Enzyme design. Structure first.
Site, short mmCIF file in Angstrom:
data_model
loop_
_atom_site.label_atom_id
_atom_site.label_comp_id
_atom_site.label_asym_id
_atom_site.label_seq_id
_atom_site.Cartn_x
_atom_site.Cartn_y
_atom_site.Cartn_z
N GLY A 96 0.78 -1.23 0.00
CA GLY A 96 0.00 0.00 0.00
C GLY A 96 0.82 1.28 0.00
CB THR A 97 -0.27 4.74 1.01
OG1 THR A 97 -1.43 4.62 0.18
CG2 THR A 97 0.24 6.18 0.98
CG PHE A 98 2.68 5.39 4.44
CD1 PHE A 98 3.80 6.07 3.96
CD2 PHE A 98 1.50 6.10 4.62
CE1 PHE A 98 3.72 7.42 3.62
CE2 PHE A 98 1.42 7.45 4.29
CZ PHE A 98 2.53 8.11 3.79
N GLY A 99 4.03 0.79 4.02
CA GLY A 99 4.20 -0.58 4.48
C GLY A 99 3.62 -1.67 3.59
CG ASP B 234 -5.32 6.16 -2.92
OD1 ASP B 234 -5.64 6.18 -4.13
OD2 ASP B 234 -4.37 5.48 -2.47
#
Ligand SMILES: N#Cc1c(O)c2c(-c3ccc(-c4ccccc4O)cc3)csc2[nH]c1=O
Ligand SMILES: O=P(O)(O)c1ccc(-c2cc(O)on2)o1
Ligand SMILES: O=P(O)(O)c1ccc(-c2cc(O)on2)o1
Lengths: 442, 185, 302
Positions: free
Chosen positions: A18-21, A132
């Site tokens: 994803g976006t982070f991690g 998003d």
């Protein structure tokens, strides 16, 4: 033996990034229960300077209790990584379902959109904007229920505040997002939801091109082909949801009032509906009962989930629920829509702040000169954005105000005035501070 | 308390040897380029090293300590704040803060010349609540529900008869009050 | 007894529960001229406005139509000469003449009970009560008798109806039936304004040449002289001052003595009028029942 385990769950195959991690499948070593574990590297967050973004994301997911948003069970912390143990959904991406079937049938497409908008409305009511929204971020379970997931690009909604960040895929981003203009941001999600609704029914994107600036030109233009298999009802809903002007763009209330959306809509997805108050828990009402009865949240729930409805804690909760319903039903008493008797007595038009035709650099100098005359003290956070302060001689308190310069047109400029909140009167202190600067500047 | 030992580097076989296991080789599970093992360790200083393809090595990104004989081994400091998420994020935010009270000095416009343009005025702010016509049926004090973005913002009338009229919408708890002030210039 | 259930309702509910979701509040600075302030009540569509003293940095009082009634009667001389004090005097200057009785600011907290709000309006003989937050010091809403009765009308089905609600108006005897101050159809505005100052009444029923009640000249009908800019001609009859608004006026609305209290409350709430003319079986005027008399019976006395 050598299995990679975190909180009794064995980490397996990667579900996606994803976006982070990274997100991996977590199987319970004893039962076989499946969970989605989002791994956040502490050093990566420190390097990208997103400590605050992650903090708000965890806080929101711990508070969020909706059947169409991925539930966060717990978050295990290690000296190098963060393990977000989330709710697992077998069906996977909505994007993969659209590709598999070609086109989602009206009966299912309406059902899925109603579930998506129910989750989007929950976020907006809790002052959170996803930013998003796409079928890649919308997941499905074994019972074919929609679930929104990636809250990486999400942001908070504040009074008199605007969001500037540009987020998400260009095919789902609103015209104001791609242009880098300021937005309130509820509207931005509606545009994204509009693209998802078109993608569900058509199996294609309404704005799609190989060349990025050509794709951006199509979004800014707001022109998209409406296929012959789509009825006039859903066609008007897609047109209202996909409007270039954010002011002319549809709101959740407008979508809820639409005849196509109204069809077979369950009475538990949205607030004020018939079966909402009897099946969906109200977070604000539980806290109000907890302080009145001096007891824990779990005890209030036990009284509601019990066999007898005449239980002491349950009746107190429903008294707040009933009173709220009566006040919510009488919309004409709290909000404006033979003439009214008070109107028998009764135009100059109102405008935002000070308007100027002068150079932006020259306007700044006039403000710094005016403040000095009035002895205001300020913090210069930005070239066009200031944080001014003035101590009142009578009350003995500081009056905070935010100054911001805007571009109306190619020849016009505007100076915005905003009150900052931490005997007298706070609102009167703001008006008197505004009146002082307006007189001095002109 | 769980502790993560990930090997970002390459190799076919990777072993973990540290003070926690009396300096013995522990086989790490590989997915792709990742060799990891989550071990339950208490709070304090822990020294460890990697054994990749039959040779001793260390992670260059992690802090290291060198002994008298010259053997490099990574050192990890297990803290009480590392166990809880919000305690760890509070420590992570402190390390993030890298390189100003109220003053009466004007800002220098820009490095060199910025030629910076002010942000384009949002159309949401142009939606004046007092201009909007409510219609005859309702009470005149009643107003429609305002957008959160127009709250606390000042709206004014052109100075006529030597009197300035100022207005702003503010929120009491779940309610919005649009106050109007008639103050002479 | 099933009585005092509405009294318990007012004690349980806060003043905050009545404040609308989105409302308009007009505030005047003490240094502002009276003429401009009375025109501002017309343009904004308000009947009252809290007064903010810029020097003291605190709310001092309320500017109502009663101030305009008192200014006109005290300073009017002729239609030939202009009312100088209405044209040049400030609110500060007017308060130094009118309130010199240094009346303190009668207000209520949004967290305070409705019982206290109903008590404050009846006790002080006022019709406009400003709601000021003690935390911020800002005025939120102006409480009236109409807003309280309309809010109570929403919860009437939620609580069991007492015995007095089913009883007739003749049995309860709610409202004024004696010493009713009235004006003839040919009486001038100046004389009607004088009765508003001396007797301190809110409305005056208009009587025809035959004796029948044709309309009602209330305190609210005075701001129309500022709206139409016809304030300097107070020699004209009450009928001549009401004819311009007579189309959408609907002043006279009657209630029979045999009619139950519940139907009278439902009539006042639906029509949004301040008072009903009490009539007998032969359609003859017996008295006047207002929103204050109604809430004095439901909330106060038990
Ligand atoms: N992104 C990436 C990433 C990880 O994969 C891990 C992992 C991890 C790596 C591999 C495995 C694993 C190993 C063998 C078989 C399956 C697995 O999921 C489990 C966890 C632990 S911390 C961490 N931090 C990261 O930033
Ligand atoms: O005593 P007030 O609070 O000054 C006052 C002003 C106007 C009225 C009024 C208007 C009206 O139709 O009934 N009463 O009451
Ligand atoms: O003196 P009252 O005739 O009993 C009376 C009842 C209600 C009002 C009133 C007037 C007003 O502007 O708001 N409420 O005045």
């Amino acid at each position: 033996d050598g299995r990679v385990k975190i909180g009794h769950y064995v980490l397996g195959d990667t579900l996606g990034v994803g976006t982070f991690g990274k997100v991996k499948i977590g199987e319970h070593q004893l039962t076989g229960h499946k969970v989605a574990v989002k791994i956040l590297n502490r050093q990566k967050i420190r390097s990208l300077d997103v400590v605050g973004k992650i903090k708000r994301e965890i806080q929101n997911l711990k508070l969020f209790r909706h059947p169409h948003i991925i539930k966060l069970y717990q978050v295990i912390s290690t000296p190098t990584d963060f393990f977000m143990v989330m709710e697992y959904v077998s069906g996977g991406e909505l994007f993969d379902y659209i590709c598999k079937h070609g086109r989602v049938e009206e009966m299912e497409a309406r059902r899925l959109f109603q579930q998506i908008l129910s989750a989007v409305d929950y976020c907006h009511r809790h002052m959170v904007v996803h930013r998003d929204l796409k079928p890649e971020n919308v997941l499905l379970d074994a019972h074919m229920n929609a679930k929104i997931a990636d809250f990486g690009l999400s942001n908070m909604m504040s009074d008199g505040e605007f969001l500037r960040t540009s987020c998400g895929s260009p095919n789902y981003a609103a015209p104001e997002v791609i242009s880098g203009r300021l937005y309130a941001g509820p509207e931005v999600d509606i545009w994204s939801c509009g693209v998802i609704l078109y993608a569900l029914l058509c199996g294609t994107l309404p704005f799609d091109d190989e060349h990025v600036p050509t794709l951006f030109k199509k979004i800014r233009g707001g022109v998209f082909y409406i296929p012959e298999y789509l009825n006039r009802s859903v066609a008007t809903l897609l047109m209202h949801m996909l409007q270039v002007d954010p002011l002319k763009r549809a709101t959740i209330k407008d979508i809820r009032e639409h005849e196509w959306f109204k069809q077979d809509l369950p009475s538990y997805l949205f607030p004020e509906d018939p079966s909402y108050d009897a099946n969906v828990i109200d977070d604000e009402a539980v806290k109000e009962v907890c302080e009145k009865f001096e007891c824990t949240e779990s005890e209030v729930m036990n009284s509601l989930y019990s066999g007898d409805p005449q239980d002491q804690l349950a009746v107190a909760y429903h008294l707040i629920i009933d009173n709220r319903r009566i006040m919510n039903q009488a919309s004409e008493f709290y909000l404006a829509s033979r003439p009214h008797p008070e109107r028998v007595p009764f135009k100059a038009k109102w405008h935002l702040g000070i308007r100027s035709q002068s150079k932006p650099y020259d306007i700044m100098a006039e403000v710094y000169r005016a403040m000095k005359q009035l002895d205001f003290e300020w913090k210069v956070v930005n070239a066009y954005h200031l944080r001014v302060r003035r101590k009142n001689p009578v009350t003995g308190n500081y009056v905070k105000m935010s100054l911001q310069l805007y571009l109306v047109d190619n020849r016009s400029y505007l100076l915005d005035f905003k009150s900052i909140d931490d005997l007298g009167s706070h609102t009167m202190d703001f008006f008197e501070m505004c009146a002082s600067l307006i007189t001095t500047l002109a | 308390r769980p502790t993560v030992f990930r090997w970002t580097g390459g190799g076919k076989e990777v072993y973990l040897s540290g003070s926690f296991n009396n300096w013995s080789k522990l086989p790490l599970t590989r997915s792709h380029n990742n060799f990891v093992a989550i071990l339950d360790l208490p709070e304090g200083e822990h020294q460890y090293k990697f054994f990749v393809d039959g040779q001793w090595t260390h992670d260059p990104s992690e802090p290291i300590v060198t002994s008298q004989l010259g053997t490099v081994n990574n050192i990890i400091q297990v803290k009480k704040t590392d166990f809880e998420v919000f305690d760890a994020l509070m420590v992570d935010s402190q390390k993030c803060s890298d390189v100003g009270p109220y003053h009466q000095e004007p800002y220098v416009c820009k490095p060199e010349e910025r030629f910076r343009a002010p942000p384009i005025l949002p159309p949401h702010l142009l939606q004046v609540i007092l201009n909007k016509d409510t219609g005859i049926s309702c009470d005149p004090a009643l107003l429609p529900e305002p957008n959160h973005v127009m709250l606390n913002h000042l709206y004014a009338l052109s100075i006529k008869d030597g009197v300035m009229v100022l207005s702003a919408t503010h929120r009491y708890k779940k309610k919005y009050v649009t106050t109007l002030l008639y103050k002479p210039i | 007894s099933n009585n005092s259930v509405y009294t318990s309702f007012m004690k349980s509910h806060r003043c905050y529960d009545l404040i609308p979701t989105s409302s308009k509040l007009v505030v005047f600075d003490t240094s502002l001229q009276v003429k401009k302030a009375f025109f501002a009540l017309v343009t904004n569509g308000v009947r009252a406005a809290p007064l903010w003293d810029s020097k003291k940095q605190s709310f001092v009082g309320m500017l109502t139509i009663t101030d305009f009634i008192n200014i006109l009667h005290r300073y009017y001389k002729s239609a030939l000469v202009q009312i100088y004090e209405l044209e040049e005097h400030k609110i500060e200057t007017w308060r130094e003449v009118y309130l010199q009785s240094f009346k303190p600011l009668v207000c209520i907290s949004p967290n305070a009970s409705l019982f206290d709000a109903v008590s404050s309006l009846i006790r002080n003989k006022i019709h406009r009560l400003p709601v000021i937050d003690p935390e911020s010091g800002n005025t939120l809403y102006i409480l009236t008798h109409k807003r309280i009765l309309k809010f109570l009308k929403l919860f009437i089905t939620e609580f069991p109806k007492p015995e007095f609600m089913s009883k007739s108006l003749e049995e309860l005897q709610i409202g004024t039936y004696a010493n009713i101050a009235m004006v003839r159809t040919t009486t001038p505005v100046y004389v009607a304004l004088g009765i508003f100052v001396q007797h301190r009444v809110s409305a005056l029923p208009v009587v025809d040449e035959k004796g029948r009640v044709v309309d009602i000249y209330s305190k609210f009908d005075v701001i129309n002289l500022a709206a139409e800019k016809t304030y300097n001609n107070l020699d004209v009859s009450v009928t001549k001052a009401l004819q311009h608004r007579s189309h959408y006026f609907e002043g006279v609305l009657k209630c029979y003595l045999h009619e139950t209290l519940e139907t009278i409350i439902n009539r006042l709430v639906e029509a949004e009028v301040h008072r009903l003319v009490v009539v007998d079986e032969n359609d003859v005027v017996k008295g006047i029942v207002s929103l204050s008399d109604i809430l004095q019976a439901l909330v106060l006395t038990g």
